[PDB]
Design a protein around this ligand. Structure first.
Ligand SMILES: [Zn+2]
Length: 36
């Protein structure tokens, strides 16, 4: 962990704690704001 290795499944800036790594990518994909 530490760096170059994700180990946290919770979007503090959104206030929604997930329970899966791939799920996080799903949130950051089209759930977290409008990222282009
Ligand atoms: Zn978010």
């Amino acid at each position: 962990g530490s760096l170059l290795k994700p180990a946290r499944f919770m979007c503090l800036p959104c206030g929604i704690a997930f329970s899966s790594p791939s799920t996080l990518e799903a949130h950051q994909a089209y759930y977290c704001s409008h990222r282009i």
